[PDB]
């Protein structure tokens, strides 16, 4: 199963949760709205330790939910949970460390990593689709699909992460998620697997363009507003293709944009299911 760690043990392996970046000898690897993720070594195993940090009971709900989803969903396109720590007021989750971080950070070439080739971007999108398919095949809604939550192993295999907001059409009183990726219905309170498909369409736009879904110092601020400029023929997808590539052919790029535009239908019932998205991505290559 999973290993129950004492909090002081994860304190030692993370060097007191050193907030300096791993790029300069620290332990901090990334940051989210619900915690900070640190690098460590547990018994020669490189690990990722997410220290959670919303009500306290709510954080325990997402802590318990992540464990329950990870206990049942094991797949090569999902991250793996090794253990956790629950003693005290601090909640921690221990995962197998991902040598290439998040897709978001690699699209931005954070810490000097080389730009991703289009060929590898295609394989990453396919792997992320296979991960979403496995979760949907087991009746789980991710509710926070974004490039920051798509991680990459040593061979750049795509692995979905962060299942604290996952659920098994329904409404809720507490709207959660990253607004730049969320479907219109999810911003209103609906919980449905079609919202995951819409968020994946934004990721495909991030993969094509290399631009993050939101950039405050950018015009347009939201990547979705750029798609609208392409629909109205005021721009084309070739004008926004990531220039940090040299192997991107227009046919495959337009094919991925077609999947993205289908995923990004405002009406959820017009969006394809993840199985159709999977097949369209396989036919793209
Ligand atoms: C941006 C992201 C964060 N946070 N980074 C990582 C995440 C994770 C990782 C593994 C499992 C899980 C589960 C959750 C959740 N729930 C979150 N993370 N997680 N393993 C590593 C890194 C990392 O930075 N590796 C170094 C690499 F990037 C580089 C280029 C050498 O610098």
Q: In CATH, what number does 103-284 get?
A: 1.10.510.10
The domain ranges of the chain are 3-96, 103-284
273 counts as catalytic: no
Q: How far is CA 37 from CA 131, 150, 188, in A?
A: 21, 14, 29
What resolution in Å is listed for this PDB structure? 2.1
Main-chain dihedrals φ then ψ at residue 131, nearest 5 degrees: -70, -45
* Residue 259 CA to ligand 1 centre (angstroms): 27
Residue 279 tokens read as: 């097949």
Experimental approach taken:
X-ray
Number of other residues whose CB lies within 10 A of the CB of residue 95? 21
* Residue 221 CA to ligand 1 centre (angstroms): 26
Q: Specify whether domain 3-96 bears CATH 3.30.200.20.
A: yes
* Residue 151 CA to ligand 1 centre (angstroms): 7
3-96 and 103-284 agree in CATH topology: no
N residues, the chain = 285
Which of 105, 144, 196, 242 is an active site residue? 144
Which residues touch 12 (CB under 8 Å, ≥6 apart)? none
Substitution candidate for ligand 1 out of 23, 110, 151 with most atoms within 8 A of CB: 151
Q: Are 266 and 184 in contact, with CB atoms under 8 Å apart?
A: yes
State whether residue 137 is helix, strand or coil. Answer: helix
């Amino acid at each position: 199963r999973f290993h129950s760690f004492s909090f002081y043990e994860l304190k030692n392996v993370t060097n007191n949760f050193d907030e300096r970046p791993i790029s300069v000898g620290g332990n901090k690897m990334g940051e989210g709205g619900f915690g900070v993720v640190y690098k460590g070594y547990v018994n020669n195993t490189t690990v990722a330790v997410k220290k959670l940090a919303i009500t306290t009971e709510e954080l325990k709900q997402q802590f318990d939910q992540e464990i329950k989803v990870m206990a049942k969903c094991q797949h090569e396109n999902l991250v793996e949970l090794l253990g956790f720590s629950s003693d005290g007021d601090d909640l921690c989750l221990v995962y197998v460390y991902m040598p290439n971080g998040s897709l978001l950070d690699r699209l931005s070439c954070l810490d000097g990593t080389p730009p991703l080739s289009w060929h590898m971007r295609c394989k990453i999108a396919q792997g992320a689709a296979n991960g979403i398919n496995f979760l949907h095949e087991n009746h789980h809604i991710h509710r926070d699909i974004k490039s920051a939550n798509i991680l990459l192993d040593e061979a750049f295999t795509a692995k979905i992460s962060d299942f604290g907001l996952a659920r098994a059409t329904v409404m809720t009183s507490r709207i959660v998620g990253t607004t730049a990726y969320m479907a219109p219905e999810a911003l209103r309170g609906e919980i449905t697997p079609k919202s995951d498909i819409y968020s994946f369409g934004v990721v495909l736009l991030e993969i094509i363009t290399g631009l993050p879904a939101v950039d405050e110092h950018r015009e347009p601020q939201l990547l979705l507003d750029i798609k609208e400029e392409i629909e109205d023929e005021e721009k084309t997808i070739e004008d926004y293709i990531d220039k940090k590539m040299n192997d991107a052919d227009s046919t495959s790029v337009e094919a991925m944009y077609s999947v993205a535009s289908q995923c990004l239908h405002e009406k959820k019932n017009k969006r394809p299911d993840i199985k159709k998205v999977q097949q369209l991505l396989q036919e793209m290559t």
